[PDB]
Amino acid sequence: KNTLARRKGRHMGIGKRKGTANARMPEKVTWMRRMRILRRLLRRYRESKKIDRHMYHSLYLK
Amino acid sequence: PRKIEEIKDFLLTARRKDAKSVKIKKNKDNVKFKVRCSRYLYTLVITDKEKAEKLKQSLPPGLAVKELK
Amino acid sequence: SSHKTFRIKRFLAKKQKQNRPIPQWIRMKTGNKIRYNSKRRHWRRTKLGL
Amino acid sequence: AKRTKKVGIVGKYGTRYGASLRKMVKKIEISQHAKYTCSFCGKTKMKRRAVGIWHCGSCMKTVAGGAWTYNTTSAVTVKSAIRRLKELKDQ
Amino acid sequence: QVLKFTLDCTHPVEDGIMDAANFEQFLQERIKVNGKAGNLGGGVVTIERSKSKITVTSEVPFSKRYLKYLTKKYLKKNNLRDWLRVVANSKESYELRYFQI
RNA sequence: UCGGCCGAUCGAAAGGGAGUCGGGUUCAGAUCCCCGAAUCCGGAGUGGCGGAGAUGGGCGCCGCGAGGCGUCCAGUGCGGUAACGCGACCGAUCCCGGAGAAGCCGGCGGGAGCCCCGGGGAGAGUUCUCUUUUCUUUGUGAAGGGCAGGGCGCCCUGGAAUGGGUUCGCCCCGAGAGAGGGGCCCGUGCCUUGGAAAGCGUCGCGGUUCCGGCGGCGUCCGGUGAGCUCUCGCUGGCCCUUGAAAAUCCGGGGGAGAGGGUGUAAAUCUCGCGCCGGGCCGUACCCAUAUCCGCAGCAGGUCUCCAAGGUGAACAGCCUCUGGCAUGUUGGAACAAUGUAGGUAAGGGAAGUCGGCAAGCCGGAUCCGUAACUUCGGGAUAAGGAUUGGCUCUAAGGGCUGGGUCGGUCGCGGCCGGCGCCUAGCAGCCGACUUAGAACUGGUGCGGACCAGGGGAAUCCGACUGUUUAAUUAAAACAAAGCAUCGCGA
RNA sequence: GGGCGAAGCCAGAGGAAACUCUGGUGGAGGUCCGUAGCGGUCCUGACGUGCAAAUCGGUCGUCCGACCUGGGUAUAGGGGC
Numbered sequence: 001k002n003t004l005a006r007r008k009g010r011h012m013g014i015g016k017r018k019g020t021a022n023a024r025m026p027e028k029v030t031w032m033r034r035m036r037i038l039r040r041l042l043r044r045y046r047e048s049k050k051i052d053r054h055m056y057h058s059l060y061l062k
Numbered sequence: 063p064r065k066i067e068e069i070k071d072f073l074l075t076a077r078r079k080d081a082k083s084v085k086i087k088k089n090k091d092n093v094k095f096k097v098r099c100s101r102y103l104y105t106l107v108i109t110d111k112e113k114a115e116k117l118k119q120s121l122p123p124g125l126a127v128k129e130l131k
Numbered sequence: 132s133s134h135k136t137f138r139i140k141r142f143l144a145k146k147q148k149q150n151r152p153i154p155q156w157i158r159m160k161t162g163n164k165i166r167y168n169s170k171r172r173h174w175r176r177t178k179l180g181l
Numbered sequence: 182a183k184r185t186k187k188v189g190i191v192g193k194y195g196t197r198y199g200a201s202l203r204k205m206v207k208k209i210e211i212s213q214h215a216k217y218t219c220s221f222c223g224k225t226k227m228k229r230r231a232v233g234i235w236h237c238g239s240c241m242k243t244v245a246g247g248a249w250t251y252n253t254t255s256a257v258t259v260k261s262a263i264r265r266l267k268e269l270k271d272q
Numbered sequence: 273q274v275l276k277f278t279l280d281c282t283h284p285v286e287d288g289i290m291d292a293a294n295f296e297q298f299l300q301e302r303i304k305v306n307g308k309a310g311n312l313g314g315g316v317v318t319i320e321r322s323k324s325k326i327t328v329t330s331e332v333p334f335s336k337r338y339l340k341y342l343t344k345k346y347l348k349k350n351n352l353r354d355w356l357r358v359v360a361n362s363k364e365s366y367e368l369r370y371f372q373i
Numbered sequence: 374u375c376g377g378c379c380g381a382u383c384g385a386a387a388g389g390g391a392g393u394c395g396g397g398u399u400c401a402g403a404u405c406c407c408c409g410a411a412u413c414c415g416g417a418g419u420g421g422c423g424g425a426g427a428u429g430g431g432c433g434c435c436g437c438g439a440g441g442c443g444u445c446c447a448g449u450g451c452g453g454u455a456a457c458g459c460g461a462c463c464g465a466u467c468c469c470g471g472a473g474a475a476g477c478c479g480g481c482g483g484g485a486g487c488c489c490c491g492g493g494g495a496g497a498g499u500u501c502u503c504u505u506u507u508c509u510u511u512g513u514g515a516a517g518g519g520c521a522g523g524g525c526g527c528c529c530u531g532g533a534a535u536g537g538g539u540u541c542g543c544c545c546c547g548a549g550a551g552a553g554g555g556g557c558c559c560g561u562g563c564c565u566u567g568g569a570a571a572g573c574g575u576c577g578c579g580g581u582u583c584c585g586g587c588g589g590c591g592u593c594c595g596g597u598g599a600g601c602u603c604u605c606g607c608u609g610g611c612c613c614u615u616g617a618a619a620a621u622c623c624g625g626g627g628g629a630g631a632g633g634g635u636g637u638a639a640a641u642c643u644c645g646c647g648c649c650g651g652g653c654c655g656u657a658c659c660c661a662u663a664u665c666c667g668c669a670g671c672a673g674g675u676c677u678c679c680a681a682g683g684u685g686a687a688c689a690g691c692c693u694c695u696g697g698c699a700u701g702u703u704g705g706a707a708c709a710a711u712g713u714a715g716g717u718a719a720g721g722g723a724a725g726u727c728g729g730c731a732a733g734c735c736g737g738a739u740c741c742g743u744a745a746c747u748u749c750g751g752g753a754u755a756a757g758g759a760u761u762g763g764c765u766c767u768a769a770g771g772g773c774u775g776g777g778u779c780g781g782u783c784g785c786g787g788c789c790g791g792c793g794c795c796u797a798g799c800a801g802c803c804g805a806c807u808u809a810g811a812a813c814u815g816g817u818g819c820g821g822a823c824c825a826g827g828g829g830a831a832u833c834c835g836a837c838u839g840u841u842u843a844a845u846u847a848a849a850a851c852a853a854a855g856c857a858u859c860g861c862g863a
Numbered sequence: 864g865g866g867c868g869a870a871g872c873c874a875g876a877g878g879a880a881a882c883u884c885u886g887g888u889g890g891a892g893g894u895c896c897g898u899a900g901c902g903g904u905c906c907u908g909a910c911g912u913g914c915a916a917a918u919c920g921g922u923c924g925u926c927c928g929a930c931c932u933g934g935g936u937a938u939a940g941g942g943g944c
């Protein structure tokens with residue numbers, strides 16, 4: 001029951017947090033997810049001919 | 063254990079000198095013929111029943127034909 | 132310990148065998164002068180030599 | 182962004198050991214951990230394995246060099262001198 | 273796509289400690305289909321009796337353990353829980369019998 | 374003729390070291406007994422059976438052809454461009470190499486076990502009202518075969534700048550990228566033989582004073598993840614530190630030799646199966662607030678493995694499940710002083726005291742905001758300030774598939790094509806947590822327990838981290854890097 | 864279990880260059896807070912014919928390193944260390 005409430009956002013707040021924001025959700029893990037999601041999208045765009053090699057390589061570095 | 067694939071290999075396996083006994087296990091889906099040799103237990107799996115019954119009467123004599131049911 | 136040598140196990144075997152009461156008929160012998168086994172050993176009170 | 186003004190690689194030492202000792206070890210630690218261009222295969226993969234031992238990852242060539250640099254200025258003049266004396270020795 | 277579960281009220285009705293008519297009268301308003309009690313979810317779940325046998329036939333995914341949950345709820349309401357006991361006598365079938373001393 | 378372990382021997386129940394697992398069984402033993410499945414090493418002289426070696430061409434003849442006879446010549450296997458593969462695949466002294474055989478730390482990824490979620494069963498719990506509810510349970514060993522999956526600094530084609538590929542980070546490439554196609558290793562995962570006959574859960578029926586009794590049914594389908602623990606792998610970092618040895622096993626180089634005259638053949642065989650054997654010693658139990666040491670059933674000491682739910686950053690603290698226990702060598706009745714341990718205290722706030730000793734204040738997280746000084750790294754959580762509950766929402770952060778212009782037709786379906794423009798990207802399905810914002814709301818209470826820095830200005834000493842008088846001194850003492858001096862060419 | 868965030872790297876901006884600034888990434892250190900462990904500051908607390916011939920309570924120091932620890936070895940008395 002309490003887990004279902006926490007899905008909707010209850011009991012999260014500011015007075016319910018004891019660990020650091022990085023201890024609760026690490027920045028390195030957040031960066032990995034973002035890199036994996038974005039690099040996957042760029043790859044799928046390259047093999048579907050939406051972008052070429054040169055636009056892919058510019059955006060990969062970006 | 064070793065799994066015998068086709069029918070013929072089981073016959074001369076059962077006709078070996080070290081073959082102690084053959085056990086027949088009737089499952090819901092298949093019939094298994096397990097001959098107990100010196101090193102391995104050779105199992106032959108028969109899907110249907112007419113071939114299993116045919117194999118039952120074609121077994122070499124003088125060998126234990128223990129039925130597991 | 133559980134791991135032991137044969138010489139140690141044989142040593143412990145003798146100590147078990149001689150740690151027993153005197154037989155009751157000893158006290159009936161002529162001129163006995165023995166009341167009890169005075170060399171009785173308990174595993175917790177006194178420890179063995181080894 | 183540039184993270185330190187002057188300490189650079191010796192920022193790992195904190196405030197310890199003295200500024201001049203950290204400055205002294207700074208240039209040695211930079212050359213100690215640098216990757217040199219291999220003179221055998223041409224790749225920039227010749228890195229220190231142990232003190233005096235320099236190994237290339239590509240051609241797997243191991244060279245005996247200096248403690249902190251791939252070659253010492255002492256040994257370079259020596260190689261030039263030995264070459265000069267050898268060509269003087271024969272004719 | 274037909275479930276056809278069965279409830280067997282034989283030993284208690286022959287001892288007269290309960291009647292199958294009332295137990296049938298208990299089920300049709302307590303059975304929930306898609307979370308709604310009453311009207312059997314639009315009549316999709318049907319109910320009938322053989323004067324001892326009460327069979328539940330459904331055309332939607334319907335759990336057998338729900339009948340045991342509902343039957344145990346009836347027995348507690350009628351103070352029969354301390355004597356009777358729902359036991360799965362087979363698949364698609366429940367049967368309530370006495371505690372064996 | 375060849376022959377250096379160039380040195381006996383001992384030295385590890387945590388190093389090296391072939392090969393046993395599943396089920397049952399006792400009052401007390403089991404990876405040891407029983408049942409069933411394997412496996413390692415050693416042996417076979419009179420050679421145990423197969424298979425391999427290895428059994429083909431040439432010429433004369435006969436023969437309708439096919440096929441038979443004689444003679445001669447081969448034959449210590451074969452396939453793939455390659456990586457390498459196939460069931461064997463002659464070979465000594467000698468030589469070369471490998472494995473054994475290697476630190477610590479970081480970050481990723483694969484696999485398992487556990488945890489979690491959604492259903493289907495079986496049995497229990499609650500039912501005052503509600504709860505399709507809550508709880509329990511819902512197997513497949515070793516060893517083979519096959520297939521996933523992971524890895525490769527392995528091969529072939531080809532030749533790349535408008536450089537490209539690519540990781541969380543990196544890193545890689547004319548010494549051969551990308552791409553296409555292959556090969557190898559690991560395979561603890563899945564399926565299969567083992568295997569359901571066993572085990573387990575339920576519901577029954579008989580009894581052999583104490584049945585591995587008999588029987589019915591079931592042992593199902595999914596989804597998740599920075600989760601935890603093992604394990605496997607990849608890639609880095611650190612070292613004036615470079616993190617054993619030896620038994621033992623294997624591969625290669627070389628070709629001394631051996632084997633037969635064309636035979637149902639030989640030498641030989643790391644291939645399949647079959648036969649025999651594996652001696653000696655240890656093995657119970659405790660392993661600690663009672664089986665050990667401390668004189669004792671002593672609040673001390675004594676090396677390890679496994680490790681659930683909630684909260685939470687968490688192996689914290691607090692509560693709980695499995696498992697365990699009986700409060701630590703006694704109880705009863707009262708509730709004096711003094712004590713030991715723990716709290717509170719109006720007003721004042723260190724006036725107490727050698728001395729703020731002791732206690733108290735602060736404390737988590739978020740958003741701001743942070744001085745002198747400084748070896749420029751720090752100081753720094755400086756200092757200082759605001760907020761924190763509950764409830765109802767709103768945004769944002771992903772993954773999977775499918776995008777056809779159609780009968781011109783028959784393999785209400787399939788091979789090509791006249792047959793069309795998602796190209797500002799849509800449609801459906803599934804899925805974790807996390808952040809931000811808003812409204813409402815309670816006697817302003819909200820890190821509500823637990824967890825959990827008081828701060829600033831200076832002076833002395835020691836640079837720091839480290840160490841020290843076990844049992845009255847942890848310090849400014851010792852050590853330290855740095856600096857300097859001295860001896861020494863064997 | 865958290866904090867700080869060294870080198871290396873990416874992007875953007877400013878620069879004639881030299882280079883500089885900003886945002887990320889990365890994860891160093893006899894680094895910090897703090898478990899287990901190791902130690903033993905203060906109460907000059909408890910106890911002081913004790914639980915104990917050195918223990919106990921709270922509070923403490925350190926907690927990736929000159930770290931903690933088992934077993935096997937070596938050094939023996941004017942000697943060892």
Ligand SMILES: [Mg+2]
Nearest residue numbers: 175176665666
């Ligand atoms: Mg004792």
Ligand SMILES: [Mg+2]
Nearest residue numbers: 382383384385
């Ligand atoms: Mg020895």
Ligand SMILES: [Mg+2]
Nearest residue numbers: 401402657658
């Ligand atoms: Mg036992």
Ligand SMILES: [Mg+2]
Nearest residue numbers: 513565567568
């Ligand atoms: Mg299985």
Ligand SMILES: [Mg+2]
Nearest residue numbers: 549550551552
């Ligand atoms: Mg390539």
Ligand SMILES: [Mg+2]
Nearest residue numbers: 569571572592
């Ligand atoms: Mg069964």
Ligand SMILES: [Mg+2]
Nearest residue numbers: 133656657658
């Ligand atoms: Mg034992």
Ligand SMILES: [Mg+2]
Nearest residue numbers: 662671672673
């Ligand atoms: Mg004790």
Ligand SMILES: [Mg+2]
Nearest residue numbers: 178666667668
């Ligand atoms: Mg003693």
Ligand SMILES: [Mg+2]
Nearest residue numbers: 662663670701
């Ligand atoms: Mg006691």
Ligand SMILES: [Mg+2]
Nearest residue numbers: 699700701703
């Ligand atoms: Mg008490």
Ligand SMILES: [Mg+2]
Nearest residue numbers: 699700701703
């Ligand atoms: Mg008591």
Ligand SMILES: [Mg+2]
Nearest residue numbers: 718719720721
């Ligand atoms: Mg007061």
Ligand SMILES: [Mg+2]
Nearest residue numbers: 718719720721
């Ligand atoms: Mg006051």
Ligand SMILES: [Mg+2]
Nearest residue numbers: 723724725726
């Ligand atoms: Mg005063």
Ligand SMILES: [Mg+2]
Nearest residue numbers: 723724725726
């Ligand atoms: Mg005074």
